[PDB]
């Protein structure tokens with residue numbers, strides 16, 4: 001293997017990593033500048049449910065970045081370093097028969113390699129499994145390959161070797177049993193009970209736990225010391241009778257701004273600058289298209305435009321094309337948006353309720369029905385913004401704008417594609433999409 005295990009049975013607490021991503025004790029002793037290697041532990045001052053229904057859980061969080069010296073603008077992204085569910089970590093230690101509180105270091109057998117450890121060391125297995133390792137996504141075939149040797153029941157070792165192989169049936173089994181069934185490492189250990197790998201080897205095989213990004217839902221002109229997040233919690237039942245939970249969203253959902261014994265809920269974070277930005281001149285009109293959580297950056301945009309108007313500045317038309325399933329189920333920021341509309345901050349609030357009728361009604365349907373005014377605004381130099389689903393929504397919306405320009409612009413499709421692409425090059429058509 002790549003690393004050798006060195007158990008530290010009597011190490012000083014001050015020398016042990018407890019979840020920090022960079023320098024030892026950086027989470028506890030916070031000093032600017034804060035960035036990816038030195039994230040700021042922001043206190044969660046607000047964590048509230050946005051949706052009216054109970055089908056899903058959509059939440060709004062406000063992270064206190066006071067005294068961090070962190071600067072951000074609406075449109076930027078905030079990254080958070082999450083922690084795995086403690087109950088899941090406990091189950092892994094139990095099924096493996098391992099003492100999770102053992103502190104150790106995994107050191108590269110190649111003493112010349114720049115990669116001295118697989119994650120911050122020395123640290124305990126509990127800490128590694130909680131903050132440094134991905135224990136929820138389906139293990140890659142290579143992991144299964146190395147794990148097979150530790151399954152003492154021949155049939156189980158055979159199963160693991162088969163799914164890790166390049167055989168025809170092996171690939172289909174891996175696809176169905178691991179990937180599609182969304183079996184995480186614990187699920188595999190439970191379903192192949194003879195599998196008993198040493199915990200240190202497992203820690204060398206698993207991928208690192210990654211930061212998750214969110215579109216900041218606040219304007220720094222209004223909340224210079226707070227970064228807001230709008231997110232939908234990931235939680236689903238698998239085809240293997242299990243309930244899988246998204247790591248970052250369930251971790252955030254559990255962040256209690258209070259917590260007995262006091263204790264403020266802290267979220268390690270940093271800001272990643274984007275090119276998604278409101279027009280330099282407040283008088284320039286904006287067309288925002290963001291269904292679902294895609295409305296996130298636009299809550300900040302509108303907050304900013306409203307603030308500017310409140311200051312006494314002249315602000316151009318500000319239009320929002322939002323969408324949700326049902327008005328009384330998942331209409332995010334319904335109250336806030338209604339107020340922005342009533343006060344004049346939001347010139348138009350066009351909402352597509354996709355499941356309030358037998359057929360689908362999406363934002364692009366509303367865009368097309370507003371083709372005349374949108375063309376006028378576009379010809380006038382308006383900026384278009386699209387945020388949300390990159391799979392279908394973004395493409396469907398782009399095609400709708402193609403058609404609008406093609407029709408109202410009295411030009412051929414190709415000429416319309418060129419027209420829109422020139423808007424993108426000139427920074428007048430921006431996208432912030434994800435899968």
Ligand SMILES: Cc1cc2nc3c(=O)[nH]c(=O)nc-3n(C[C@H](O)[C@H](O)[C@H](O)COP(=O)(O)OP(=O)(O)OC[C@H]3O[C@@H](n4cnc5c(N)ncnc54)[C@H](O)[C@@H]3O)c2cc1C
Nearest residue numbers: 212213214215230231232234236246247248249293296434
């Ligand atoms: C630039 C950028 C900006 C973003 N902004 C936002 C934002 O503002 N708001 C927001 O809510 N999210 C946003 N996201 C998505 C966000 O980063 C996370 O991916 C999301 O919150 C889920 O993370 P998680 O850790 O909870 O889920 P994870 O633990 O990472 O799990 C997610 C994975 O679970 C699987 N999955 C989910 N549902 C099912 C199902 N029914 N069946 C089978 N597998 C399933 C998929 O493989 C999915 O990729 C953004 C992403 C990017 C790249």
